[PDB]
Design a protein around this ligand. Structure first.
Ligand SMILES: CCCCCCCC/C=C\CCCCCCCC(=O)OC[C@H](O)CO
Ligand SMILES: *C/C=C(C)/C=C/C=C(C)/C=C/C1=C(C)CCCC1(C)C
Ligand SMILES: *C/C=C(C)/C=C/C=C(C)/C=C/C1=C(C)CCCC1(C)C
Ligand SMILES: *C/C=C(C)/C=C/C=C(C)/C=C/C1=C(C)CCCC1(C)C
Ligand SMILES: *C/C=C(C)/C=C/C=C(C)/C=C/C1=C(C)CCCC1(C)C
Ligand SMILES: *C/C=C(C)/C=C/C=C(C)/C=C/C1=C(C)CCCC1(C)C
Ligand SMILES: CCCCCCCC/C=C/CCCCCCCC(=O)O
Ligand SMILES: CCCCCCCC/C=C/CCCCCCCC(=O)O
Ligand SMILES: CCCCCCCC/C=C\CCCCCCCC(=O)O
Ligand SMILES: CCCCCCCCCCCCCCCCCCCC
Ligand SMILES: CCCCCCCCCCCCCCCCCCCC
Ligand SMILES: CCCCCCCCCCCCCCCCCCCC
Ligand SMILES: CCCCCCCCCCCCCCCCCCCC
Ligand SMILES: CCCCCCCCCCCCCCCCCCCC
Ligand SMILES: CCCCCCCCCCCCCCCCCCCC
Ligand SMILES: CCCCCCCCCCCCCCCCCCCC
Ligand SMILES: CCCCCCCCCCCCCCCCCCCC
Ligand SMILES: CCCCCCCCCCCCCCCCCCCC
Ligand SMILES: CCCCCCCCCCCCCCCCCCCC
Ligand SMILES: CCCCCCCCCCCCCCCCCCCC
Ligand SMILES: CCCCCCCCCCCCCCCCCCCC
Ligand SMILES: CCCCCCCCCCCCCCCCCCCC
Ligand SMILES: CCCCCCCCCCCCCCCCCCCC
Ligand SMILES: CCCCCCCCCCCCCCCCCCCC
Ligand SMILES: CCCCCCCCCCCCCCCCCCCC
Ligand SMILES: CCCCCCCCCCCCCCCCCCCC
Ligand SMILES: CCCCCCCCCCCCCCCCCCCC
Ligand SMILES: CCCCCCCCCCCCCCCCCCCC
Ligand SMILES: CCCCCCCCCCCCCCCCCCCC
Ligand SMILES: CCCCCCCCCCCCCCCCCCCC
Ligand SMILES: CCCCCCCCCCCCCCCCCCCC
Ligand code: NA
Ligand code: NA
Ligand code: NA
Ligand code: NA
Ligand code: NA
Lengths: 268, 268, 268, 268, 268
């Protein structure tokens, strides 16, 4: 079977196949994912009037991310189940080409909505001090798009060209470090001249942000984290990757949105 | 045929097959399930302004659960019909591997939304007395997630490893007893210093909670409740399990939400 | 072929097959059905504030029924088209087992929502006089569920066991007569001490109720109404049954809801 | 092959097949159709408060028609693509019986919603003078249903029995002429004692009504308008018919609704 | 294989086939497209009350375009994946006739909503000076429809008749130049007697308009832009075309709508 520049799930699914647990888990975690997003959409819409008009843009942007994330995860869940089919003679699910190969790249292009809107929404809650809004916004959006695109290219080479995979991901990482550096400047300015309770929320938002956002590059490298022919180069790694995605999606999108609403309430 | 760590429906469906009644009933009860949830969604949204602002979070959380439960039951209903196909020569529905094996695990991971939100929503209606909100919330969420996850593992071994099934379910049970113990402390504190009419509603909520939540472990054990090769190890048990799920979903999600709204009204 | 406890559509569809007209009509009438329900949903939501707050629960319950009925009819419409497939050599649609057998039981379990909510909603518009609300509600809900369940069993025996079909439907009928007796007591109490215009609406609601609700048992018996091997034991009866269902669904759900809103307006 | 009482699209699709242009166009025009309807739904809902409460029923009814028309056109678009399949050896789309025969009758039964609601909605904007509302409403609804039903029968005989097709359509026409006669009486009464600007809108509504509604009988006769074996008895006529439907649907439903809102604004 | 008047994607997909990257990218970019549109729908609805009543029509029309664009892109995304299927022996996706040929014409007919509504919506924000609203509206709508229709014809000949493709596109272009000429007159009148900040936004709207709208004819010519048998006559051009569409859809529909809301805010 010639798979070409495909993701490692397809190679696992075409050789070993997936056990019931691996196949079902992956389907279940993607389903939890999209349910959280649609549930989050309703929450953010229903709580808009819980904050001053000046902060209501943050609820709106949280809802815009929820829609993107719902539609994407819903599609990816159907994509997963269409790509792998059960073989009763062996009792494992194998790659079914009729359903197309499974690709994570669906998420990446959808992050062209999520990442800009997530970085933007804090600038409608915190007040900056030494930094200008257009400048920060422009840095966030430029580096976000660069990070996403360079990463989207690399992920097509995860099995077919390991050098390319690592170089594109290295470049993507440099844009990610820049986003982190700017979000730190934003959180620190935002803490200036606000209540101790709001500085506590901004402190938590910074940890959430740092961990949740670092899960994505960790999903990118998941197959190779246990090395050459390691534990993770297998159905366990396939499960690990979609699990990490779901955790990072809930944390980076919903819980972040909730924490930002709590900060808005404290400042209202 | 090799089914592996699959649910007992697949083994019934692969050997005996399901009669028209068993197959149709199961499809009908899952359909009733998701219709109730979407109907409940609309009810909770349309009644939000029937309570004081301080209690409106409970309506919002009821609606968040409705969305989760709708999406899950809708998917599981399509999953059921895709997995079993009619054989005209024998007149029974048999496992169709093309549709994947049927798994209840879809529900379990979706309870990672439901259980936390259901336990949380009472804390926005009752007032605690000797117990601190963060502490109770944290206990509810930790034990909930532990209960769900340990149970989610066990259910994959219901046929393949009975020992594992029973040990994981035993561990899950210990977390469940802890949730019950805490919800009793919450109901009793909540009854302190409220009207006799509200204490009556909280009394009913406690019984609803106790029975509806105990149905889930009962669905978990359903195939084996009549023993080895008993009445329930059969298409009757398959019907019994999805019936019990639907009853427990309506009771634990919709009727609980309605009762909590009635309590909020009495306290408004 | 062995069909077992299936509905008479399957036996017609497996022997004679359906003409273009019979197959298309049935598909068209189910489609009209679900379109009416979704259109009704929007109407009831958009008119909620046309009545006093005390009567707005009736609009809400009308909307809850619309959702149930939409989802069910939408599913049944897809079920119809999946079960019967066109045979070009004969020019008739024949039962396709791959799509599963067609069953009316989907409606029945969905009436566990509709019947309770329809009977409940009048009690939020009329005022009872000698009758207590909990008592009436409890009678309506108990007899409704009994009527539905006993009827749901019988319909699986319409071809396979005529005795069973008739006995279960006879039992179902006794619960139906009780519902009628109670709704008469409700309408008569409700007429006491209201304007002549509202007593006219309640008079109409009672006729609507009595005819529309009696259509359901008539659909239940449809194949046999023209006797053994009569006109209706055929594709004409299949068409007749789904037609009667659609008429009764529009009358019992939408037009009833509209009439109850008109009564609420007169009492506002 | 035996097609029976089917629409002429099926005979074209089974003999000649459709060119890429004919097949794609028909799919595109049905898609435009349902997009307009869902877009219209949003417009009518968002503009409800642009008119006095007394005229807001007209916006509501416009939205009820939009839902019906959306659901129907969405279904018919999927029906079209399922019925005709591409044959690479010849490069034309041919009738695929697996997808069922294509039938226009879906629209007809859905007009049992549209026609009554469209005729009704003007009576919530104009004021009648010598004519009584119940009487006019009853005439509109009776003749509408008669027109639709007699026409729905005829369309099944467009190829199989030309005499029947023409007789049923002739009867349908007589009910249509009655609707026209009554709508003229309504427009003329409605013009009495209103501003010159509103009489201008009612003048336009009357032309819109007369042309848009006359397109439907023109679609009914489309195959035969160029005679025996004429230009229109072909894939061109198939395209012509769905084009005419889409134009008439936009005109009779959306533009009419918009014009009625403009009249309501002038009278507010 | 006889493809007839089909788009160039089908010829590429039938000869060379698409690599994983080409096939996946195209699927991903169409998915981003429809997610942006549904996310935009929510944004425009949630911000309606951020502007004076007189400008709220512009938000409504932005939302009407979002619905059209969502439904179309959602359909086209499913169309793409249905038309091309994976061949494991070669590792490329090839045209699957069962899914129908892929056609861009779906977009074109949907522009019969978008183009009129986009041109109309500025006339609800700017005030004209020497130009009459009906006159401008009528010019925009006539030329828009002419541009779209002539272009819709041409695109069916992109491979089959290059002369026809170029002549129809030339005619379409003349209507496009007229739209540009009129939108310039509108922007210049609109700038007269408004604040410097609003003239800056109108200056940006004009550039957005000019570039975003010129991308469409560029997508039309994409295969031939690198000449005879050039780089773009290939899977790269297929990717380039859908990429350009998505960029132009986001720019011309969402960002334009957002900029018009900012202008409305400055004038409120
Ligand atoms: C599809 C179903 C929609 C329900 C349509 C219900 C429309 C009934 C309107 C009743 C109403 O408001 O009537 C007022 C009266 O007719 C003024 O004289
Ligand atoms: C909800 C979506 C979010 C917050 C997405 C975030 C994505 C990243 C932070 C991606 C980062 C990557 C790298 C730093 C290297 C590897 C490639 C990426 C794109 C996965
Ligand atoms: C609406 C969803 C609800 C309330 C879900 C509740 C689930 C439980 C109480 C599950 C309990 C279990 C045990 C106590 C043991 C066996 C395994 C479980 C997870 C089914
Ligand atoms: C919209 C749904 C409604 C009002 C459903 C009503 C259903 C009945 C009144 C059913 C009655 C039946 C009998 C009296 C005998 C035969 C079995 C039943 C369940 C069809
Ligand atoms: C949006 C739906 C509308 C306004 C439907 C209108 C339908 C008609 C005016 C149908 C008329 C017909 C005849 C007068 C003769 C042939 C049969 C009919 C039903 C197509
Ligand atoms: C969101 C949709 C928009 C703004 C659509 C715009 C479409 C055009 C400006 C199309 C122009 C064309 C030409 C000028 C020549 C070739 C054919 C067309 C229709 C693509
Ligand atoms: C599996 C998906 C489950 C989704 C659950 C989402 C839960 C959202 C709640 C976020 C918690 C908000 C921050 C809590 C801080 C507590 C400390 C304090 O406020 O004193
Ligand atoms: C292809 C489908 C496109 C849908 C577009 C629908 C546009 C509907 C708007 C029509 C409003 C026309 C009102 C009549 C204007 C008369 C002139 C005047 O008011 O002076
Ligand atoms: C098949 C699913 C049907 C769903 C129906 C749900 C109905 C829930 C509505 C109300 C439950 C109220 C229970 C408590 C009643 C107490 C009586 C009292 O107030 O005296
Ligand atoms: C499951 C997806 C949606 C989740 C929405 C978030 C739900 C929890 C929101 C918590 C808000 C803060 C409550 C503070 C209570 C302090 C007393
Ligand atoms: C990754 C997606 C980013 C969206 C960008 C939308 C356009 C932003 C342009 C900002 C330029 C400002 C110049 C000052
Ligand atoms: C074995 C071949 C390695 C090629 C790696 C190419 C990676 C991308 C080059 C830089 C892109 C910027
Ligand atoms: C043979 C399997 C691949 C071996 C090389 C893996 C490289 C891992 C790189 C991880 C970087 C963080
Ligand atoms: C997402 C969690 C993945 C855990 C894997 C840990 C590594 C296992 C091999 C050592
Ligand atoms: C190999 C034998 C054991 C199989 C174990 C299966 C995997 C563990 C079960 C799932 C663990 C994660 C479930 C919780 C997901 C939480 C997501 C939050 C967002
Ligand atoms: C299936 C969707 C959920 C429906 C819930 C309906 C709940 C009942 C309506 C509220 C009852 C409030 C108490 C009324 C008592 C009147 C005296
Ligand atoms: C066959 C006997 C042991 C089966 C596996 C038991 C595992 C239980 C879970 C441990 C935590
Ligand atoms: C041996 C009899 C067991 C009866 C169980 C019937 C179903 C119980 C759950 C509903
Ligand atoms: C359909 C049936 C719904 C059942 C909801 C709960 C019924 C409560 C009965 C009243 C309790 C005693 C007064
Ligand atoms: C001949 C067979 C007769 C079967 C009659 C079944 C009746 C069931 C009644 C249940 C209450
Ligand atoms: C053919 C089967 C025999 C006829 C049965 C007729 C039963 C009629 C019941 C009407 C109440
Ligand atoms: C495409 C479906 C939605 C159509 C909406 C039509 C909106 C424009 C109608 C005109 C609005 C008033 C014009 C006053 C000048
Ligand atoms: C094509 C269907 C039109 C709607 C029919 C709804 C029922 C109409 C009832 C009218 C009753 C009039 C009674 C005399 C005044
Ligand atoms: C509420 C909707 C009501 C729709 C009823 C539609 C009834 C369709 C019945 C079709 C019967 C066709 C066979 C007889 C036709 C006789 C005339 C033509 C003879 C060739
Ligand atoms: C092929 C015969 C056509 C008969 C004439 C029908 C003409 C259209 C209706 C007037
Ligand atoms: C021979 C001339 C046929 C003209 C038919 C045109 C059809 C137009 C329908 C919109
Ligand atoms: C991405 C799909 C959804 C559309 C999102 C539209 C972008 C919303 C934000 C636009 C900017 C609003 C105004 C910002 C003013 C900042 C002033 C300081
Ligand atoms: C002076 C009268 C002009 C009327 C124009 C409006 C009616 C036509 C609507 C078409 C909308 C655009 C279609 C592409
Ligand atoms: C091979 C020559 C074909 C020329 C086609 C011209 C089509 C456009 C005609 C004007 C409109
Ligand atoms: C294969 C021949 C290509 C001709 C291209 C004509 C020019 C197109 C762009 C201007
Ligand atoms: C998205 C547009 C891509 C343009 C590529 C231009 C052609 C490059 C080769 C010469
Ligand atoms: Na699968
Ligand atoms: Na099935
Ligand atoms: Na069919
Ligand atoms: Na097709
Ligand atoms: Na594909």
């Amino acid at each position: 079977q010639e798979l070409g520049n495909a993701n490692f799930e397809n190679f696992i699914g075409a050789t070993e196949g997936f056990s019931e647990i691996a196949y079902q888990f992956t389907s279940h975690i993607l389903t939890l994912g999209y349910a959280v997003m649609l549930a989050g959409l309703l929450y953010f819409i229903l709580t808009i009037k819980n904050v001053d008009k000046k902060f209501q843009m943050s609820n709106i942007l949280s809802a815009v991310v929820m829609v993107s994330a719902f539609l994407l995860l819903y599609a990816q869940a159907q994509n997963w189940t269409s790509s792998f089919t059960f073989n009763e003679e062996v009792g494992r699910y194998f790659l079914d080409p009729s359903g197309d190969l499974f690709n994570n790249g669906y998420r990446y292009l959808n992050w062209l909505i999520d990442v800009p809107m997530l970085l933007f929404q804090i600038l409608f809650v915190v007040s900056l001090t030494t930094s200008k809004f257009s400048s920060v916004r422009n840095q966030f959006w430029f580096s976000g798009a660069m990070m996403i695109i360079t990463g989207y290219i690399g992920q097509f080479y995860e099995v077919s060209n390991l050098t390319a995979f690592l170089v594109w991901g290295a470049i993507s990482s440099a844009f990610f470090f820049h986003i982190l550096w700017v979000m730190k400047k934003v959180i620190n300015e935002g803490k200036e001249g606000i209540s101790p309770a709001g500085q506590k929320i901004l402190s938590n938002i910074w940890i959430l942000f740092l961990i949740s956002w670092t899960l994505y590059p960790g999903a990118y490298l998941m197959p190779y984290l246990t090395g050459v022919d390691g534990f993770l180069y297998s159905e366990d790694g396939v499960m690990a990757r979609q699990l990490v995605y779901t955790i990072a999606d809930v944390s980076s999108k919903v819980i972040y949105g909730v924490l930002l609403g709590n900060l808005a309430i404290t400042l209202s």
